[PDB]
Symmetry: C2
Subunit: 98 residues, 2 copies
């Protein structure tokens, strides 16, 4: 089962598109997503080639639901397997205004 071991950033701008490196326990590159949620949900933008040897993922943050927030919005991020929707424990993530 799924685990986010580390992320180099736990915050990002509401506009999205910012690169993060996430370290995970073993995943399958074609059966993995990164889900940001609050239910609002957005997905990390990456392809299977951005999964590094099943143990890391380089991705770009999704745009948050509201790019006009005036203060930070606390969300969660989890790994999720596409096939059976199994998830990791969530990590907090802070979206901040532009």
């Amino acid at each position: 089962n799924l685990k986010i071991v580390r992320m180099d950033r736990t915050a990002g701008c509401v506009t999205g598109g910012e690169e993060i490196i996430l370290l995970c326990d073993k995943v399958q590159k074609d059966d993995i997503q990164i889900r940001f949620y609050e239910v609002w949900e957005g997905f990390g933008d990456f392809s299977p080639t951005d999964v590094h040897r099943q143990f890391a993922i380089c991705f770009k943050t999704p745009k948050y639901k509201d790019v006009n927030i005036t203060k930070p919005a606390s969300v969660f991020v989890q790994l999720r397997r596409k096939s059976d929707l199994e998830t990791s424990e969530p990590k907090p993530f802070l979206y901040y205004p532009e």
Copy 2:
């Protein structure tokens, strides 16, 4: 043989101590170093537990040789095996003034 596949930062402040995540091809956690060089050399600060499943390394940058530079200093970074001193191809890295 050794390869730096990606680093989340390719620059840092001369004072060192900044966290980087490096993605690499397979290493042994007890037989790996990260060497910054220009011969001046400094080493990434990490322990074997900071090596993630042999495919990534979380480390802190070394302090540069001169913390009083007034413009950026271009150095190289390589993986190096401690046992036999085998190295990866170098990646450029820019140190910048405080």
